[PDB]
A paper describes a structure:
In this context, we recently reported the characterization of a novel xyloglucan utilization locus (XyGUL) that confers Bacteroides ovatus, and species harbouring syntenic XyGULs, with the ability to utilize this abundant vegetable polysaccharide across sampled human populations. Here, we present the three-dimensional structures of BoGH31, BoGH43A, BoGH43B and BoGH3B, expanding our knowledge of the structural determinants required for xyloglucan degradation. Our analyses highlight key adaptations in these enzymes that confer their specificity for xyloglucan oligosaccharides, while also providing a rationale for the maintenance of two divergent genes coding for GH3 enzymes, and similarly two divergent genes for GH43 family members, within the same PUL. While we were unable to determine a structure for BoGH3A, our structural and sequence analysis of BoGH3B has also allowed us to highlight further potential differences between these two enzymes encoded by the operon. Together with existing biochemical data, our analyses of the three-dimensional structures, and various enzyme-inhibitor complexes, of BoGH31, BoGH43A, BoGH43B and BoGH3B provide molecular-level insight into the stepwise breakdown of xyloglucan by the BoXyGUL.
Despite significant functional overlap with BoGH43A, BoGH43B, the second α-l-arabinofuranosidase present in the BoXyGUL, shares just 41% sequence identity with BoGH43A and appears to be significantly less active on the substrates tested. Crystals of BoGH43B were obtained by hanging drop vapour diffusion using 0.2 M sodium acetate pH 5, 20–30% PEG-3350 as mother liquor and they were used for subsequent structure determination. Remarkably, given their apparent differences at the amino acid level, the structure of BoGH43B appears extremely similar to that of BoGH43A, which can be superimposed onto BoGH43B, using GESAMT, with an RMSD of 1.24 Å over 482 amino acid residues. Comparison of tertiary folds reveals few significant differences between the two paralogues, with the most obvious being the presence of a metal binding site, occupied by calcium, towards the C-terminus of BoGH43B. Such an equivalent site appears entirely absent within BoGH43A. However, the Ca2+-binding site in BoGH43B is located in the C-terminal β-sandwich domain, on the opposite side of the molecule from the active site, and similar sites in other family members have not been implicated in catalysis to date. Superposition of apo-BoGH43B with AraDNJ-BoGH43A reveals that the three residues implicated in catalysis (Asp38, Asp148 and Glu198 in BoGH43B) are absolutely conserved. The only difference in the BoGH43B −1 sub-site is the replacement of Phe93 (in BoGH43A) with a tyrosine residue in BoGH43B. AraLOG stacks against Tyr187 in BoGH43A, which is replaced by Ser196 in BoGH43B.
Residue numbers in the entry: 25 to 531
Amino acid sequence: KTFRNPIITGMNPDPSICRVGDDFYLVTSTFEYFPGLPVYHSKDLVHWKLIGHALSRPENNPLMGCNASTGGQYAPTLRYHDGTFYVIGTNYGGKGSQGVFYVTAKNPAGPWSDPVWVGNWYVDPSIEFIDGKMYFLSPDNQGSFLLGVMDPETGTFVEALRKVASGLGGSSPEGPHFYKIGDYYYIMSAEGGTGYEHREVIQRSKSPWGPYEPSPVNPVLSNMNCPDHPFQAIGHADLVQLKDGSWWAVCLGIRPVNGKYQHLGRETFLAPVTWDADGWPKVGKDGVVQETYLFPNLPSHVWMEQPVRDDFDQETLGLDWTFIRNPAHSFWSLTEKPGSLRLKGTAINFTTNDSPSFIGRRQAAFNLTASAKVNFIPKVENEEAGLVVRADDKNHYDLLITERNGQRVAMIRKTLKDKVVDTTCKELPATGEVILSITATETTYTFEIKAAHVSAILGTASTRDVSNEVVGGFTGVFIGMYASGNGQANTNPADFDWFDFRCLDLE
Ligand SMILES: [Ca+2]
């Protein structure tokens, strides 16, 4: 048996893992998206199932006012000690955020606690449980790493933060984790940046408090030295040890199109870690995270496939569905028209930093088909609803039903650099159901419509123009249902009977 990387696709950056007996749990960063910090579950490190989110409530994910793509939830760390799971991270820019927080749970599916604010703004806070102590390791935004000890109950520092080590020469020392393995305490961290020079490095000491000395086989993992490789910007790893004693790393990376641009976001990868004779870890001979590997020494456990169609025919919204900042439940219902997701477009659109009536999911494949049957009668030109390809608040493609010159129409509208650049309309019948459809390849999104007396490819757009390299920030594309009255509320609701999502990267 083998597996193909990546192990979790679509926007899933900054992976943090822990093993609790036969079960593995993993979290990734979410930024402005709610619920925050999804928790995935596996029994083989390869097949992952979404089971909850660490931040499923507005009191533990305050997001209002945060910037798209550079605000909200940054790298989380996930750990487990004495019947209790802990997730620590940083919230930047949300009204009511005090910076670094953690939340706890007995069940990793939830419910999680309200935040325990630790009282600083350090990025990439990490925790580890060693010798009956809860260590807190973070960078100091000045090239150095700070270690401290923390009371699990209160989040207060019992031993205060102090400098113990620093980065090893590379840009933006990030993502430090603390491990006690054999004779030594190890600080493993990321350097180089967000780009091609990203790498994981390690150092160790006889004592937690230093001094630390660098690995002679740095880096631990990087695709820096293979510019041909289909995976790039590999880094921000977290280690996990199995019951057979062997070691695996999860880390983030990108899958560029023609080696130039990435739009799906930073995804999660899996690589075997080997320790050399002197006690230093490395992935392979060269540190390169490969496309396929021999399977972990664990029994294969494939999860029941999620169906293509969400029929919106139960009271509980599927866990993959995602909102922008803190959603008011007043804009959506699965109750009010049973069998449909009812979306009520408000005055709010993307141009502010609160929560527009948007519900979407991560584009988890280059090649896909996404479609939705929607009932929407607009009464005036400002009113619209349909599907959106979102990169951020300034960059998104809108496949919407609206009213133009007393005709109900289907519209593809391309917004880039916060300006509308292209708009193409086709006339719909005055009433009746409309199937809106978005199909994707590595390079192109194609937008299609179907109704009574109306079926047509409406337009195309580039994946390149929504890519990280053009738009900046720390996110990747979401495809979602959308309604907005652009200054006014929509008169009528937009009712989505179903939503198909088909990933086709295997073929
Ligand atoms: Ca339905």
